Structures are given as C-alpha cells and as structure tokens.
Amino acid sequence: SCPKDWKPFVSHCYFILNDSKASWNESEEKCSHMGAHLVVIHSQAEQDFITSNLNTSAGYFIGLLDAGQRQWRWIDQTPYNKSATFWHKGEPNQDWERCVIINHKTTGWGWNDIPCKDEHNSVCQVKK
C-alpha cells in the first residue's frame, strides 16, 4: 500500500513534485528523503501511467543521465534500451546535455535532454 498522496501502478508508487521547481540534484535529494528516487521508465505502460498524471504545460525530471559519451544510465542501475525509450524526434542528438525531462509537445509526450542545472518539476518512484 502506497504512502499518502503517492499513486500506485503495479509494484511501484509515484509522486509528482510540482510544489516548486528544482535542479536535478535538488529534485533527486527531495525524492531520496522520501526513501525514493527520480523515476525510471522501463515500459510503455509506465510512460503512459506517468504522463496521464502530468500537467501538459510543465517538464519533469526523470532518473536518466548521460554517464559518458551519450551512454545513458538509469540511476538505479537497471538496463537502458533504446527500443524502450520515448525521446522526442531529434532528441538527444542536438547537444551534449546530460539530464532528461518528460514534456509535452503539440505532437505529444516524450523526453528531451536538458541542462541538469535547470529548474523543473519531477517525478519520484519507490517500490510498493
């Protein structure tokens, strides 16, 4: 059973941090205090569950970082597979920024790489 105001989806609970905007490290620090971490998305089902909970005008940090030369790693060390990803078109090939937000274009939801320093909402997850 999920903590108060967390939303269940199968064996995880999710929390949308939209109280205010924070950098990646600050966002992750907020999740870790809750015993959680920035969200790790492994399937269409998770992506779909998460986006129906998001405001279409805002961007949300996820737990994905470029650990090298476009060598994407999830912060909980589970495998990254391009086949399982939701990059907006042209992402993440325009620049070398290391952090990643879910956001909405008129064309729909997806991911953009952005500076880790930039301040955004985010989504935490923890095992149910």
Place of tokens 């949300």: 60
Expt. technique = X-ray
91 is in an annotated binding site: yes
Number of structural domains found in the chain: 1
Per residue in 51-81, is it b (16+ CB within 10 Å) or e — as a string? beebeeeebbbbbbbbeeeeebebbeeeebe
Report the 10 Å Cβ neighbour count for 50: 21
55 is in an annotated binding site: no
Instruction: State both tokens at 73.
Output: 């790693």
Domain assignment of residue 69, given as a range? 1-128
113 is in an annotated binding site: yes
End-to-end Cα, the chain, rounded Å: 6
Q: What CATH number is associated with residue 48?
A: 3.10.100.10
